Amino acid sequence: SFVEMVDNLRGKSGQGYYVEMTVGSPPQTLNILVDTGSSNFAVGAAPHPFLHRYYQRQLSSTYRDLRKGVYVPYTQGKWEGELGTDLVSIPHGPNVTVRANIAAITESDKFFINGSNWEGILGLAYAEIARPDDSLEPFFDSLVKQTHVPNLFSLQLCGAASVGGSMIIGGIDHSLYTGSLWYTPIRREWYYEVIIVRVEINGQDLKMDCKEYNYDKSIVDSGTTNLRLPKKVFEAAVKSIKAASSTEKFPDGFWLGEQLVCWQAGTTPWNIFPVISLYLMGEVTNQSFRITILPQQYLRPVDDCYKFAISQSSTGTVMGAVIMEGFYVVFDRARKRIGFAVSACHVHDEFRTAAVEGPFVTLDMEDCGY
Numbered sequence: 001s002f003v004e005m006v007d008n009l010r011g012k013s014g015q016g017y018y019v020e021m022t023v024g025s026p027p028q029t030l031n032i033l034v035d036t037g038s039s040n041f042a043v044g045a046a047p048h049p050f051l052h053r054y055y056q057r058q059l060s061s062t063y064r065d066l067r068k069g070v071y072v073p074y075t076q077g078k079w080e081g082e083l084g085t086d087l088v089s090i091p092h093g094p095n096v097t098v099r100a101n102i103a104a105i106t107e108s109d110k111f112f113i114n115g116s117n118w119e120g121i122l123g124l125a126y127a128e129i130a131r132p133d134d135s136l137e138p139f140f141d142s143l144v145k146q147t148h149v150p151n152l153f154s155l156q157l158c159g160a161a162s163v164g165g166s167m168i169i170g171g172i173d174h175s176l177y178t179g180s181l182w183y184t185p186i187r188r189e190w191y192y193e194v195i196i197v198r199v200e201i202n203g204q205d206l207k208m209d210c211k212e213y214n215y216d217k218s219i220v221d222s223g224t225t226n227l228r229l230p231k232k233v234f235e236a237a238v239k240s241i242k243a244a245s246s247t248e249k250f251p252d253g254f255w256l257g258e259q260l261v262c263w264q265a266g267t268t269p270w271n272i273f274p275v276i277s278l279y280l281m282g283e284v285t286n287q288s289f290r291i292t293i294l295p296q297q298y299l300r301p302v303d304d305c306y307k308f309a310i311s312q313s314s315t316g317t318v319m320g321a322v323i324m325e326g327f328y329v330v331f332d333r334a335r336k337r338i339g340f341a342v343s344a345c346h347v348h349d350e351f352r353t354a355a356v357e358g359p360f361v362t363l364d365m366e367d368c369g370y
């Protein structure tokens with residue numbers, strides 16, 4: 001059923017995960033970025049120094065022009081283009097063809113990455129955050145409307161240059177995870193917004209007002225590399241991580257992700273870096289669950305060299321690839337919930353392991369929403 005979709009994701013570290021798609025008639029093959037942090041489907045449609053290939057509207061009999069412009073700004077990079085529609089397929093996905101909105105990228109700034117091997121982006125979030133407005137139906141909505149594909153998809157992102165993973169469209173693949181799935185409500189259908197109710201570092205509560213954790217918002221974004229935290233939360237976390245690792249001293253700019261830390265190969269002191277536990281709101285009253293991430297996740301490999309992959313945000317908490325790696329993440333749009341489970345490619349060391357645990361009791365969870 002879903003075995004055809006296992007391992008359909010490829011990528012380079014820090015440069016996102018992409019799936020193979022085809023657009024137009026006859027089909028044009030492109031590598032498309034998988035992004036739960038946006039809602040626009042767009043592809044390079046003009047020559048660019050970093051593009052191996054691009055979408056040629058002229059060669060598609062099925063292309064239709066919508067005669068409207070569009071731009072999308074991301075935390076990293078931005079592009080503008082022309083709106084249109086065409087037939088789209090996913091070779092290593094469901095056996096269907098849909099007519100979907102496509103943005104033909106004609107100009108861009110720091111969007112395409114030299115050597116990334118992808119030429120477009122697939123925004124998997126909801127219409128509310130689509131550009132220019134919410135009348136531009138996102139791809140997955142079109143897929144569900146035009147076909148019998150269930151309103152659900154799941155992402156298994158695996159870590160270590162080259163990375164891989166699975167995007168299971170229309171269901172859940174049980175051979176890809178162990179233990180139970182734990183679900184947190186989608187608070188509002190715009191980004192995939194959730195609510196963090198508690199934070200622990202090495203078993204110690206950060207003891208901040210839980211509103212700070214979701215200050216503005218908290219989202220699940222496969223398009224973002226880092227765990228991005230609101231300033232106050234970032235400072236609290238960094239202070240604690242500095243304290244646990246204090247046995248060693250690191251250039252101050254390491255903590256800002258500006259310069260690397262290097263250790264002799266096989267000598268990396270993982271044990272001085274703490275585990276981080278994020279408690280998410282559960283499905284029943286006063287009930288949370290926690291996901292625990294290891295330093296191997298937020299110390300992204302770049303002698304063995306690493307970059308601190310926890311950074312500041314002015315748009316709320318962004319749970320990026322460092323969080324999603326090692327877990328099987330289910331985007332259950334039909335039941336307005338996001339599931340977490342330990343992935344089959346989960347990260348662990350000799351004494352510590354990434355985990356999804358519950359149930360936990362957490363009082364006044366509704367107070368944590370901004």
Ligand SMILES: CCCC[C@H](NC[C@@H]1Cc2cccc(c2)CCCCc2cc(cc(N(CCC)S(C)(=O)=O)c2)C(=O)N1)C(=O)NCC(C)C
Nearest residue numbers: 015016037038073074075076077129223224225226311315
């Ligand atoms: C409200 C938050 C929304 C986040 C959301 N992020 C998704 C985008 C998609 C996207 C765009 C370009 C390239 C990639 C992927 C490939 C990987 C590059 C590394 C990276 C990416 C992001 C972001 C980073 N970082 C920060 C800036 C460099 S980092 C280093 O991981 O902290 C790195 C980021 O914002 N990817 C967004 O911009 N949505 C658009 C909006 C109009 C709906």
